[PDB]
């Protein structure tokens, strides 16, 4: 679901910046499928409005998130 | 930058879904850098919140922005 996606990431970007990314806050995003983006990850661009992902620095700390 | 990057995506998020990725919206983004998405393009990832990317589908159609 986009919608719901879309919420998850915008409850992200406004709340957990900052925070390492845990399970615990994995399983709080109930929306599927979640990708996690590090620095340097090599991506085939195929934009999916269901698909959350979250970008991570290299230090697992969430920077920011959105559907795609 | 990031504040009048978040601005120009909301605004194509809000009036440009659907429409073709011509010269004319071009000229209407002034930030800079502006990234076009397409379809199978591969990217090397590394989150720049000033950075205003165009999500456009195989029609060259607009369906998303985000600031990243």
Redesign the interface.
């Known amino acids: 679901d986009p919608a719901t996606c879309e919420k998850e990431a915008q409850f992200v970007k406004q709340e957990l910046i900052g925070q390492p990314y845990t399970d615990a806050v994995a399983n709080a995003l109930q929306s599927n499928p979640i990708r996690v983006?590090?620095?340097?990850?090599?991506?085939?661009?195929?934009?999916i409005?269901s698909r959350l992902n979250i970008?991570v620095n290299e230090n697992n700390e969430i920077?920011?998130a959105?559907c795609?």
């Open positions: 983006l590090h620095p340097g990850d090599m991506i085939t661009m195929e934009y409005a970008q920077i920011s959105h795609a």
